[PDB]
Symmetry: D3
C-alpha cells in the first residue's frame, strides 16, 4: 500500500517540538515532496491566511502567479482555520487571539499515480483571550487537490 498520510505529516510538523521532527523531514526528503513551516501570532484571521500564502510562495511550494495553485491552497487554508476557530472564523472581532505553528506539504500521497498532487495545510497552537495564560490549544487540517 504505497499510500501516505500527507495530513498527518503536516500536522506532525506543526505540533512536534523542533528537533523531534526528524523522521518526518526525512520522509519528505525521500519522497521529494515540497513543504514549509512557520508561525503566526494573530488577532485577525486574514493574517493567518497571509502568513501561509506568503510562506508557501517564498519556499516555492506553490506558484503565486498561478491561480489554480493559489485557489487550492486558499481553500485548504480555510479548512484548517476552521478546525482552529470551530464555527466562527473571528478572532479579534470575538475578543480572542491565536498563536499558531503551521505547515504545508505538497505531494502525491495516493497509490494510483493519476491521483496526482495534493496539498495539506495544518495548524497547531493556542487560542485565547488577549492575555497571557488565558488560553488553550487548537488544531486544524485542510486537504486539497492541486
Amino acid at each position: 500500500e504505497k499510500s501516505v498520510r500527507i495530513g498527518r505529516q503536516a500536522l506532525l510538523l506543526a505540533m512536534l517540538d523542533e528537533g523531534e521532527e526528524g523522521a518526518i523531514l526525512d520522509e519528505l526528503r525521500a519522497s521529494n515532496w515540497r513543504y514549509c513551516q512557520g508561525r503566526v501570532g494573530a488577532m485577525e484571521p486574514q493574517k493567518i491566511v497571509a502568513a501561509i500564502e506568503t510562506a508557501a510562495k517564498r519556499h516555492e511550494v506553490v506558484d503565486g502567479s498561478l491561480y489554480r495553485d493559489m485557489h487550492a491552497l486558499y481553500h485548504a487554508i480555510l479548512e484548517a482555520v476552521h478546525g482552529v476557530t470551530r464555527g466562527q472564523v473571528e478572532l479579534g472581532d470575538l475578543l480572542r487571539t491565536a498563536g499558531l505553528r503551521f505547515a504545508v506539504v505538497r505531494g502525491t500521497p495516493y497509490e494510483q499515480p493519476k491521483e496526482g498532487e495534493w496539498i495539506a495545510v495544518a495548524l497547531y497552537g493556542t487560542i485565547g483571550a488577549p492575555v497571557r495564560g488565558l488560553e488553550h490549544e487548537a488544531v486544524g487540517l485542510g486537504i486539497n487537490h492541486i
Copy 2:
C-alpha cells in the same frame, strides 16, 4: 508547576500508529490522568458523539450521571467534530462518511493548580465518499474545563 500540552497528547494518541505512542501513554501514567481511545466509523454525526460518550464513561474518564461532566465532554466533542467536518456538521446528509480514531484525555494541564481539571477530545481519520478509497484525511480538537 509545569504546564502541559494535553491537546497534543490526545491528538498524538488519535493519529499515531499503535505501538508507536508508548511515550505518551507513559507521560499519562506519570501524571495519573485518565484517558481513553477509540475508533468510530460514521455516516451519522450522532454516532461519533455516542461512541466517545460510551468510551469516556467506560474507561472512567467521566461520570455519565453527573451532568457537568457530560456537558463539558459534549462541547469538547462538537469542537473536535467541527475540525473534521469543517463547517457543516453533516455526513450522510451531505453524501460523505467518516473513518476516525479518537482519544479523550482529562487532567490538570496548567501551571496553576487552581486551574482545575480540563478535558481534551481529538479526532483523526478519513472523510470521503461512501466508496472506499475516495477520501482524505481530517482532524479536530476540542478543549473544555471540567
Copy 3:
C-alpha cells in the same frame, strides 16, 4: 402612537409559569393582536417548525394558504431556533433533544402605523442529552414583518 415590545410579550409567554402571565394575555386583548402558545418536545428540528405552523394556523395567527404569511412565519421560526441551537441547527443528529414552549404574537408594534403588522416567535425550554435531567435551558426569538 405608542410602540410595543412584541418580542418580549412572546418571550414572556413562552417562559413564565402558567397562570403567572395574566397581564400579558390582557395587553393582547387590549391591542386585539392574535397569538398562540405551545409546547413541543423534539429530537428533530423539523418537528419544532411543524408544531408552530400547526398552532399558528389553528389559532388563526396566520393563513396556511397564503404564502406571504407562512414565509414570514417560517423565517421567524428559524431565527428563534438559532437561539436555541446556537449554531448547528441539529438535535438528534448531534445526540441532543429539546423540551420547549413557544408563543407566536402578531400585531402592529411600531408607533408608525404604516409599519404594518410584524410577527414574533419565541422559544424557551431545555436542551440536553436524551436522558432526562441531563440538560440546561435555552431560548430564542425571531421577528419578521408580515
Copy 4:
C-alpha cells in the same frame, strides 16, 4: 424539586423594566448567588463580549485571573450572542448595530449538590440598521458549567 431556572432569571433580569425585577433580585439574594447587569450599544461584536467580561469581573461574579472562570463565561457569552445575531456574529461588518441589556447569574441551579456551579448569560434588546427606529428586538442565552 430544588432545581431552579437560572437562565430564566438571567433573561428576566435582562428584559424586565427596571423596578419590575424585584422578585428575581430577592430570589437571588436568598440563594446567595452572584449576579450582575448592564447595557451595551454595539456595532462590533467584541464590544459585547468585552462589556460582559468587564462587568462580570468588576462585580466579582468571576475571577478575571482564573482561566477556567473566564473560559466558562466566554463560551456562555458567545452562545447568547448567537441568539442575538442568528447565524453570523457580525454587526457593523453586516451593516447593523445592537443596543442590549445583559445579565449574568452564577449559582448552583440543580438539585444534586455535586452538579456544582453554573453560569448563565442573557441578552435582550434591539438590533437594526444604524438609524433610529429601523430596528427590532433580539434575545440570547448561554449556559455553562463553572
Copy 5:
C-alpha cells in the same frame, strides 16, 4: 399560469451583458415593477449591503424611512451575499475581495393577487484574491416578501 420568475429576472439583469438585457427590461416595464441595477467592488461585506440599500432607495424601489421595506430588503440582501460567500460572509477578513453586479426587482410575481409584493436581490460577479486575475465567479439570490 400568471406566475413569474422574479428571481430569474433579477439574476439575468445581474449577469447578462449590457445590451443583452432588453427583453427583461421590457417585461419589467410591462409589469410595471420597480427595479434597479448597479455594481460594487468590495473587500468588506457591509459595503455590499450599503451599495444595495443606497441603490434601492435612490431609484425609489424601496422607502428608506419605512422599516418594513428596509427589513425586507436587508434580509434578501444577506441571502444573496450568502450565495456569493458560501459559508462565511467575510471578504477582507479572510483575504479575498469581490467585484459584483447587482439587481433588485420588486413585483407581484405570484398568481394569487393576495400574495402581494415580493422583492428579489441578485448578485453576480467574481470573488478572489486581491490580485488581478486570481479570481472566479460567484452568484447569489435573496427573495423576500415586502
Copy 6:
C-alpha cells in the same frame, strides 16, 4: 487567449427554459467542453449531490474512479448548495423541500493555458414548504479547479 464566464454558462443552462439556450450549447460545442444538465427534486440534501454525481459521471464530465475529479466536483456541489440553502444546509430537517435544475460545465476558462481545467456547478429552482405553490426561487454556483 480569451477568457470565459464558465459559471454564467452553467447558470444560464440551469435557469433558462428549454430550447431557449441554444447559443450556450453552441459556445460549448465550439470550446469542446464537457457538460451535463439535470433536474432534481429533494427534501434531502444528499440527494442533490447524488443526482449531480450520477449525471456528471454519466455524461463523462468527470471520472467516478478518480478521486481528484470527484473531490473537485463534491466541493463545487456544496458551494452551489450553500447558495440554495443560504446558511443551514438542511431541507426536510428544516421542513422545506427543493425543486431544482442543475448543470455542470468543465473546461478551461482562463486566458492562460496553464490555468488548466476548472469545473462549475449551478443550481436554479424553487425552495419552499412541502405543499406545492408555497415556495420561492433560489440559486447557487460553485467553482473549483479540476
